[PDB]
Design a protein around this nucleic acid. Structure first.
Ligand SMILES: [Mg+2]
Ligand SMILES: [Zn+2]
Lengths: 13, 1340, 237, 251, 148
DNA sequence: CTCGTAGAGTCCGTGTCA
């Protein structure tokens, strides 16, 4: 994973 | 000679003939906007481009089309003056014709039904005035041009810093007009990595795989082949003699039983030549030579059918044996070398992790959008949209041209999206540069930098708006119904209007106009800029972009640039420079034939100019254009040197084409150091117009062009004779040659009286001609601010002396006489505007009543019955301009006032006094008052009177114009009615009206008379309509901001005199501050008793090499001597003959010049007029690099009976004793910069304080304190001044109780303080406690 | 460039020469504009580091110091002893080249008179107290600091000297931006220091030390130049 | 605070607190509503992100102000930075009893004197003039003294000349490279608007008369005046603090 | 949250597709949330509806007439007394941030709650004078005056 | 001589000033 901090990406995943 | 030129002729030094004349100075702006509107048939630059780019709009196969047809521009609601006064923008409505086509489902496509909706309104586009400015919100603005890097492909080096081991790391880049950036770069290991615009690094082979490419295809593309075969043994390798160059022989290179080369010796030139001559193609080598190769194409066993050998792996003995036993006889190996063909793509493939197209696409998608799952369709769509989507990507026409020429192609036309071929070419070129073939390109070259103007920017904003509207329309039509909707509700002008307004109103390139001088405006309009959107930044510029590239010669001025943080990022335009059709700057050069310098001009850009050899401007020629001296100095490729006479290709067109207008207005520029020339060029813009500006005695000849090209002066459109002149109007009776068949008409010019500029200066035009005087086309009829007879005049020329005077000119300071102030030489008029707004408050509305509380008749003497100051009243600081009262209540007085009112019984009023008053220290005269009242409110008496005056003035103006035009048309009617039967008696006797009434018995003239009567009635009706429109416009309502009921604006005229502390400067970068005003009888005087106006220090010249001022002083002295001679000759009225002879002798007075003056002038009228104009001094002209010389100045001094040395004996006014060491006296042209001391002095003791941090409100509009920084704290700590510092940062600024106690103590006469604690510390404690931290004050 | 500007400002400069000079003009302007900010930052850091140093004592009664000698590079002198030792206070009594006599007593502010007396004789090296070797903790003492001041006397007690030092160092910041043989420039004796050499058959001394220096002692015992002789050098005398 | 014309201005901390409170309330409602796990987890993540933005902004997503692209100002951004409280309000505050003007030559002065315009002196010394007027019986109440000063009567000028006798002032030039950029002089009232500076102190100040400006401060307390007269006077600073060489040489 | 409410309040007997019902509830919830918690100074939902209708009508007038809609014309076109329109126009702003560049907007905000030092000095002088005058008077009369 | 640490090379990146 890219270790992104965006909650949007986590919720979409 | 033109009349304006023949009134006063400027004696002109200068030997170089002129072939090309200065062009229109404001051409770039006008051309850009014209191209922007430019209704043209072909789809190109303009609004047509955007309309054809967006439309037609197609639905999701919905069988409906919305197709563009045409467009037009309406007429502005308000003109420039109305917009300026009201406070709105000056623009025109955009009306576009749209046609909607709908198809039925489903059958062959056809015109089911088309609704031709007409004139859909789409926002407004601001218009450009006649001079190149915009009126956005009642304020003039200028849209400066931008210098930005052009689209294309550029190769850099990044030499040096990388790894601190040399080994420069090359790279490339592709920059589109609109889209993402591609990039390639090398690394310390020599691996080609590719980066998306700014994302993470990646091997270069991922992209190649993503383009549907395989390892074999890549190897074939980026490498060559080597042939191997086994002629039954010993690897009879197929050799090429050419490839053997640059290597050491490893075996016995022999053929045909002959050993051309033997093992143990490296290949040499002779060996290669012998192999070429002997035609040896095949040799024999052991397996050792082939053990180190790399196989291109995979190899598999035919018998077994297994992938024994794949592509791109290092070979081995076992692999060779396997391939040989498997029947393989030919093997291909990449031709690799350590000098010419490095193994870069092979290494990238080895390190590349991906193997197939899908893996590469997944990798790209993950890199671009990390953290989300990848999919085949999503990755494919992303890759297609990134670089190969015409909607999200477009390079340019110019971008495509640059990209093609960089790759050495013969076609400069292509598509707006990349392709596999372009990427392959870029990669190949980068690899070739890495291998040692080719050269990188420098960024600062002006062949790589492009210039943008207003039209392009406005078109881009319009395109953005259209794109948004088109997307919205697509969505609405797809989702919404398509059976009855008319195409007037699916398109909204809101987005286009928003985009255009955002660009024009709130942008870094739309700048508040500079209006100090005509010169300031001219230089503002011709300005380049590297900042702004899409450009660099002040703090991230560097030392290599703020530098004078050699390509600037003839295109950008090298000595005019700001001296602050943004130095080298402005680069005012040159004099002869233009803009290419692609946006590149070009300059003119004279075409040179075999040996004859022709007179045909060719415009060349940097790329073209680099090749040819260009001669110099100051190259002697002899009446056939033959270079007199054989070795002519030229410059060919970024360098200069001597060249043969019959080897030059071009020649400079003029000696002025290296500088701008501002730097071309400086005489004797070649004698001034560069720094001081830059300072003078920057300062000459800031001069403020004086009460009467006369002229420069020593000029250069660029004054007339600057004065005329600027729109301050009034210039005759057609020739004629002046029919009526006044301080507010000029009427010209056009010649019989220039009048059209009908509408004989007359020219009327309305002058601009005292108005205000952006900088609060005065703008005033005054007549320049007299009654019954001829005028020709292009003449000047009215002077603007700071011009005289059509010439520019920014300052005034004074009598100066260079000597020290008792330390009153110690530093750059100056000593001025009293006769300079008595004669009002440097007096200026400034106009201010003040406003008083009546708002609505919760308690109640405000009032503009004239009955103010607790104020006597003294303050209300100048207020009329309505409560507004009179016109013409002379007010002083602290006076009341407009009265006003605000409601109030519940004062809540403390017991003491209760007792006081009980004893005295004085009532407490409920209305506060909030009237408008003149600022302290300023006194002037009221010259204009305006009143704006919100719609739906009663108008007071003053407003009604003002509007009645306005209506009467408008009617009078229209009537006067109609009567002038009616006199003209009566002359026309006399001319016409003379024909068709000539009746001299009837015309004189018959009244003008009766002329049209009469008609012939029967002829076409009867119909013509009927038509004339009908047209006269129509003209009467249309004039009535104009009057009604004017009246309705004057009487309509006002659209004001919410909460305002009335607005009153007052204009005060202030006259500023000269005083110590004011700043004066010359044209050679010599500044100073006036130090004293000396009496007339204390100034030094010469033998004749005439004092000296100003005294300057001699110590400023030697340390600052600006020798131009001394030459200017000498030449001014000579000119004034000639003028004095003429004046003395004229006072005793000798005769016309003596004046003619002397003036002719003065005009000749040269060494091979090109003046060529009379005798051809009028007998005595013209000569006497010229003498009267010259009696104050003969003007001189000195071009920049072709001016006067010392010998000519000495001759001019000798003719005027002056000491050729330039120095005279002076005496001391206070003693009568004569100074030793004769002094240098002359005339110099001095300016008055707008650094007035009345705008600088400031002081406070107490006042308002901030809200969050209770500190004084620093500034100037409010009192504000002087900031006490940390450097001053260190300075006070260096001493032992603890108490001063403590009071400085405790009681003076921030501690409230300390402030009050200190004030009371000072009043009471006790100088003591109680420090306390500042408020900022408490604020900091609370803020830090708002976090999780816990900070407290201990005690022990 | 390979060709210079052969004209001056009394005469005229043609287009090419003036265009050439513009380069240096603009470069100098930019360089000054940036050096100002660099100097400002450096002075801020300097003030930050040592802003709490004050003279909190009168005399720590120490005996150490720094041995002050004139700095002579090659055959030239760049800094005399008078400027180096003027204002300091001696740590140990200074003895003249003729021993058994105390030219100056122990710690005493060396003002102009003492400097003139020293220069009268052939004093070459004098030891003076320095603030780097002060015994006072949480500050420095007046004797170990010295005299230098806008005043001419010794330093007072309670003075903030760190800020003064930082400001003094930072103020002039904006103004900043073969040989096989050695030949003497003055007559005198030749002194060898830290030298180990052997004479060859031909009659020369073989430099057998990697840290050999060549001195110059005059008739007054004052060195006039300093040269370093690398290992393996031919000796003349 | 409300602005003139019905407009309002507020701090970003207000909107940050509003966001935090709203998300906390929504999370509480969801918990009380027995929502699925995913919704509760997302609400918790949103609350944590809001708290992090409120405390220290620009670490995760740099939330920008509504209707604008500028990022919000976090609590940590107020304390720190070159424009924070520590460096902008705790060491560089504005002060009262001060002014500035353009400097001139004034070659007739003495080494301890300067030239101060009458208007600047009057407006700087107002309170002293009020006190003197009340003391001398010319004005019964402070309002009468204020009116007299505003009318600019001759007695006012005499009182000012009496109150400015031996009161030194401090003159400062913009770049204070060393402690010689501030010195104390004895004002001499003149007519005009430019400050006259002794020629010998220009080198120490690094000042030239081509548009330079200078500021003047008035020491109030008695110890402040004594310090100005005994430590900062122009006749007390003749040698360079960097080296004992004089700094008042003729230029 | 709205979809949870809809699923809780769903009946499959009618046979309609759940999409429309869920969309109805979700849209209602989203609109209510935007109305309630979208502004620093919250305003009632009916005011939001009035503002939206006014904006739509103004857009229609601007498109049809070309030049611009004036408040009076938007008055007669609507069916209100032309003053509520002005109030709704005035009540349609949002607070500004104090860090807007110009220096910053927050540096020009004056404190209007402070009392001038001259006022304090005047009050002190008045207090002293009143005390002196009261002391001048008699005992009982002065005491009564103070008490009153 | 294999394989474990553990130095030590690397190095890529987050950070902090101007
Ligand atoms: Mg200056
Ligand atoms: Zn010590």
């Amino acid at each position: 994973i890219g270790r992104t901090t965006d909650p949007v990406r986590m919720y979409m995943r | 000679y033109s009349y304006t030129e023949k009134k006063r002729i400027r004696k002109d030094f200068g030997k170089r003939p002129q072939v090309l004349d200065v062009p229109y100075l404001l051409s770039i702006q006008l051309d850009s906007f014209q191209k922007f509107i430019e209704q043209d048939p072909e789809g190109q630059y303009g609004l047509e481009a955007a309309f054809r780019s967006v439309f037609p709009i197609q639905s999701y196969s919905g069988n409906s089309e919305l197709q563009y047809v045409s467009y037009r521009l309406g007429e502005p609601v308000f003109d420039v003056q109305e917009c300026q006064i009201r406070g709105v923008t000056y623009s025109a409505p955009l009306r576009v014709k749209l046609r909607l086509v709908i198809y039925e489902r489903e059958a062959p496509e056809g015109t089911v039904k088309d609704i031709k909706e007409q004139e859909v309104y789409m926002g407004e586009i601001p218009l450009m005035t006649d001079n190149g400015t915009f009126v956005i919100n009642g304020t003039e603005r200028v849209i400066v041009s931008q210098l930005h890097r052009s689209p294309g492909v550029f190769f850099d080096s990044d030499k040096g810093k990388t790894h601190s081991s040399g080994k420069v790391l090359y790279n490339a880049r592709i920059i589109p007009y609109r889209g993402s950036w591609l990039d390639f770069e090398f690394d310390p290991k020599d691996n080609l990595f590719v980066r998306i615009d700014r994302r993470r690094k990646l091997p270069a082979t991922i992209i190649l795989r993503a383009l549907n490419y395989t390892t074999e295809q890549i190897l074939d593309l980026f490498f060559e082949k080597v042939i191997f075969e086994i002629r039954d043994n010993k690897l009879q390798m197929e050799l090429v003699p050419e490839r053997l160059r640059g290597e050491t022989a490893s075996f016995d290179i022999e053929a045909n039983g002959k050993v051309y080369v033997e093992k143990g010796r490296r290949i040499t030139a002779r060996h290669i030549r012998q192999l070429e001559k002997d035609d040896v193609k095949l040799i024999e080598v052991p397996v050792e030579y082939i053990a180190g190769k790399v196989v291109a194409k995979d190899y598999i066993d035919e018998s077994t059918g297994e992938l024994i050998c794949a592509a791109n792996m290092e070979l081995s003995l076992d692999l060779l044996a396997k391939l040989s036993q498997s029947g393989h006889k030919r093997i291909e190996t990449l031709f690799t070398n350590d000098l010419d063909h490095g193994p870069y793509i092979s290494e990238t493939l080895r390190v590349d992790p991906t193997n197939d197209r899908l893996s590469a696409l997944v990798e790209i998608y993950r890199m671009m959008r990390p953290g989300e799952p990848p999919t085949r369709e999503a990755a494919e769509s992303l890759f297609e949209n990134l670089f190969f989507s015409e909607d999200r990507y477009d390079l340019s026409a110019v971008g495509r041209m640059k990209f093609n020429r960089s790759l050495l192609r013969e076609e400069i036309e292509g598509s707006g999206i990349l392709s596999k071929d372009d990427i392959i070419d870029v990669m190949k070129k980068l690899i070739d540069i890495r291998n040692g073939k080719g050269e990188v390109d420098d960024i600062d070259h002006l062949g790589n930098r492009r210039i943008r103007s207003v039209g392009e920017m406005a078109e881009n904003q319009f395109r953005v708006g259209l794109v948004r509207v088109e997307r919205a329309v697509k969505e609405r039509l797809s989702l919404g119904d398509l059976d009855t909707l008319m195409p007037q509700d699916m398109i909204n002008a809101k987005p286009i209007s928003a985009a255009v307004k955002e660009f024009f109103g709130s942008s870094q390139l739309s700048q508040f106009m500079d209006q100090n001088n005509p010169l300031s405006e001219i230089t503002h309009k011709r300005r380049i800029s590297a900042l702004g959107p899409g450009g660099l930044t002040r703090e991230r510029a560097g030392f290599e972009v703020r530098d004078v590239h050699p390509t600037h010669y003839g295109r950008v001025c090298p000595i005019e640039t700001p001296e602050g943080p943004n130095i080298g990022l402005i680069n005012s335009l040159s004099v002869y420079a233009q803009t290419n059709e692609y946006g590149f700057l070009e300059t003119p050069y004279r075409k040179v034939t075999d040996g004859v310098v022709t007179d045909e001009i060719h415009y060349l850009s940097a790329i073209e100019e680099g090749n040819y050899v260009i001669a110099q401007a100051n190259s002697n020629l002899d009446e056939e254009g033959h270079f007199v001296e054989d070795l002519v100095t030229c410059r060919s490729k970024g360098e200069s040197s001597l060249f043969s006479r019959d080897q030059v290709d071009y020649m400079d067109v003029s000696t002025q084409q290296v500088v701008s207008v501002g730097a071309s207005l400086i005489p004797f520029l070649e004698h001034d150091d560069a720094n001081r020339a830059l300072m003078g060029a920057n300062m000459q813009r800031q001069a403020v117009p004086t009460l009467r500006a006369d002229k420069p005695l020593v000029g250069t000849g660029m004054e007339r062009a600057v004065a005329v090209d600027s729109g301050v002066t009034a210039v005759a459109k057609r020739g004629g004779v002046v029919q009526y002149v006044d301080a507010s109007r000029i009427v010209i009776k056009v010649n019989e040659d220039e009048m059209y068949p009908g509408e004989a008409g007359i020219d009327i010019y309305n002058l601009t009286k005292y108005t205000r500029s952006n900088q609060n200066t005065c703008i005033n035009q005054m007549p320049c001609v007299s009654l019954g005087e001829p005028v020709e086309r292009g003449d000047v009829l009215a002077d603007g601010p700071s011009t005289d007879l059509g010439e520019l005049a920014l300052g005034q020329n004074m009598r100066v002396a260079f000597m020290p005077w008792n330390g009153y000119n110690f530093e750059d300071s100056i000593l001025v006489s009293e006769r300079v102030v008595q004669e009002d030489r440097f007096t200026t008029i400034h106009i201010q505007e003040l406003a008083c707004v009546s708002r609505d408050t919760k308690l109640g509305p405000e009032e503009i009543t004239a009955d103010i509380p607790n104020v006597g008749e003294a303050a209300l003497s100048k207020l009329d019955e309505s409560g507004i100051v009179y016109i013409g009243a002379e007010v002083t600081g602290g006076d009341i301009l407009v009265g006003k009262v605000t409601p109030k209540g519940e004062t809540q007085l403390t017991p003491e006032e209760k007792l006081l009112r009980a004893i005295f019984g004085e009532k407490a009023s409920d209305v506060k006094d909030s009237s408008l008053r003149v600022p302290n220290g300023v006194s002037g005269t009221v010259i204009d008052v305006q009143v704006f009242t919100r719609d739906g409110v009663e108008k007071d008496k003053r407003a009604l009177e003002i509007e009645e005056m306005q209506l009467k003035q408008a009617k009078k103006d229209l009537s006067e114009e109609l009567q002038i035009l009616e006199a003209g048309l009566f002359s026309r009617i006399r001319a016409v009615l003379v024909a068709g039967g000539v009746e001299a008696e009837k015309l004189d006797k018959l009244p003008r009206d009766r002329w049209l009434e009469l008609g012939l018995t029967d002829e076409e003239k009867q119909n013509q008379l009927e038509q004339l009567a009908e047209q006269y009635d129509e003209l009467k009706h249309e004039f009535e309509k104009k009057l009604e429109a004017k009246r309705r416009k004057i009487t309509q309502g006002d659209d004001l901001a919410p909460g305002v009921l009335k607005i009153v604006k007052v204009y005060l005229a202030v006259k500023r005199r000269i005083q110590p502390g004011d700043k004066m400067a010359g044209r050679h970068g010599n500044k100073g501050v006036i130090s004293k005003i000396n009496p007339i009888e204390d100034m030094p005087y010469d033998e004749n008793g005439t004092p000296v106006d100003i005294v300057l220090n001699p110590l400023g010249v030697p340390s600052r090499m600006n020798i131009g001022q001394i030459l200017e002083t000498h030449l001014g002295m000579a000119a004034k001597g000639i003028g004095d001679k003429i004046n003395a000759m004229l006072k005793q009225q000798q005769e016309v003959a003596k004046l003619r002879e002397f003036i002719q002798r003065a005009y000749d007075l040269g060494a091979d010049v090109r003046q060529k003056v009379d005798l051809s002038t009028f007998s005595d009228e013209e000569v006497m007029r010229l003498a009267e104009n010259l009696r104050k001094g003969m003007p001189i002209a000195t071009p920049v690099f072709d001016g006067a010389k010392e010998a000519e100045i000495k001759e001019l001094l000798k003719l005027g009976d002056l000491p050729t040395s330039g120095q005279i004996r002076l005496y001391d006014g206070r003693t009568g004793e004569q100074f030793e060491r004769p002094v240098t006296v002359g005339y110099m042209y001095m300016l008055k910069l707008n650094h007035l001391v009345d705008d600088k002095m400031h002081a406070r003791s107490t006042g308002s304080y901030s809200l969050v941090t209770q500190q004084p409100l620093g500034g100037k509009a409010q009192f504000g304190g002087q900031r006490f920084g940390e450097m001053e704290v260190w300075a006070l700590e260096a001493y032992g001044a603890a108490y001063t510092l403590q009071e400085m940062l405790t009681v003076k600024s921030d501690d409230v109780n300390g402030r009050t106690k200190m004030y009371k103590n000072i009043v009471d006469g006790n100088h003591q303080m109680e420090p306390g604690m500042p408020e900022s510390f408490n604020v900091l404690l609370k803020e830090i406690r708002s976090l999780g931290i816990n900070i407290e004050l201990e005690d022990e | 460039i390979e060709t210079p500007i052969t004209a001056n400002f009394r005469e005229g400069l043609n287009v090419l020469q003036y265009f050439i000079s513009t380069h240096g003009a603009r470069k100098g302007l930019a360089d000054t504009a940036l050096k100002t900010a660099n100097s400002g930052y450096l002075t801020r850091r300097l003030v930050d580091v040592a802003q709490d140093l004050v003279v909190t004592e009168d005399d720590c009664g120490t005996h150490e110091g720094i041995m002050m000698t004139p700095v002579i590079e090659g055959g030239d002198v760049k800094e005399p002893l008078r400027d180096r030792v003027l204002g300091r206070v001696t740590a140990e009594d200074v003895l003249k080249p003729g021993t058994a006599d105390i030219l100056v007593p122990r710690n005493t502010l060396l003002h102009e008179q003492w400097c003139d007396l020293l220069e009268e004789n052939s004093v070459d090296a004098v030891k003076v107290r320095s603030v780097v070797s002060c015994d006072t903790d949480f500050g420095v003492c007046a004797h170990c600091y010295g005299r230098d001041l806008a005043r001419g006397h010794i330093i007072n007690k309670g003075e903030a000297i760190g800020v003064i030092a930082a400001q003094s160092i930072g103020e002039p910041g904006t103004q900043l931006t073969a040989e096989s043989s050695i030949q003497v420039k003055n007559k005198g004796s030749i002194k060898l220091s830290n030298v180990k050499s052997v004479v060859n058959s031909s009659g020369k001394l073989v430099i057998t030390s990697r840290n050999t220096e060549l001195k110059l002692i005059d008739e007054f015992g004052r060195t006039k130049e300093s040269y370093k002789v690398p290992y393996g050098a031919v000796l003349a005398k | 605070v409300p602005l003139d014309g019905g407009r309002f201005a507020t701090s970003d901390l207000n909107d940050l607190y509003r966001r935090v409170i709203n998300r906390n309330n929504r999370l509480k409602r969801l918990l009380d509503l027995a929502a699925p796990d995913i919704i509760v987890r997302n609400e918790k993540r949103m609350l944590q992100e809001a708290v992090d933005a409120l405390l220290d902004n620009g670490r995760r997503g740099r939330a920008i102000t509504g209707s604008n692209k500028r990022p919000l100002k976090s609590l940590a951004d107020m304390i720190k930075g070159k424009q924070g409280r520590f460096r902008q309000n705790l060491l560089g505050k504005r002060v009262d009893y001060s002014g500035r003007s353009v400097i001139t030559v004034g070659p007739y002065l003495r080494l301890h004197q300067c030239g101060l315009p009458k208007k600047m002196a009057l407006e700087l010394f107002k309170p002293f003039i009020y006190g003197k007027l009340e003391l001398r019986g010319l004005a019964t109440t402070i309002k009468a003294a204020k009116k007299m000063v505003e009318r600019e009567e001759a007695v006012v000028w005499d009182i000012l000349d009496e109150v400015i006798r031996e009161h030194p002032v401090l003159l400062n030039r913009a770049p204070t490279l060393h402690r010689l950029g501030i010195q104390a002089f004895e004002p001499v009232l003149i007519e005009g608007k430019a400050i006259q500076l002794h020629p010998l102190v220009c080198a120490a100040y690094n000042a030239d008369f081509d548009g330079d400006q200078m500021a003047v401060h008035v020491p109030l307390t008695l110890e402040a005046q004594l310090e100005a007269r005994a430590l900062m006077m122009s006749t007390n600073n003749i040698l360079s603090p960097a080296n004992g060489e004089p700094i008042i040489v003729p230029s | 949250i709205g979809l949870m409410k809809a699923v809780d309040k769903f009946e499959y007997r009618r046979g309609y597709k759940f999409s429309t019902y869920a969309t109805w509830w979700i849209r209602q919830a989203i609109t209510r949330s935007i109305a309630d918690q979208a502004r620093t100074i919250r305003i009632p939902v009916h005011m939001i509806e009035t503002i939206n209708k006014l904006n739509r009508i103004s857009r229609q007038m601007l498109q049809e007439m070309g030049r611009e809609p004036t408040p009076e014309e938007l008055a007669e076109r609507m069916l209100m007394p032309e003053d509520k329109i002005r109030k709704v126009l005035k009540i349609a702003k949002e607070p500004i941030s104090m860090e807007t560049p110009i220096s910053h907007l927050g540096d020009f905000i004056e404190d209007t709650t402070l009392e001038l030092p001259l006022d304090s000095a005047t009050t002190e002088s008045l207090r002293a004078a009143t005390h002196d005058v009261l002391a001048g008077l008699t005992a009982r009369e002065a005491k009564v005056l103070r008490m009153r």
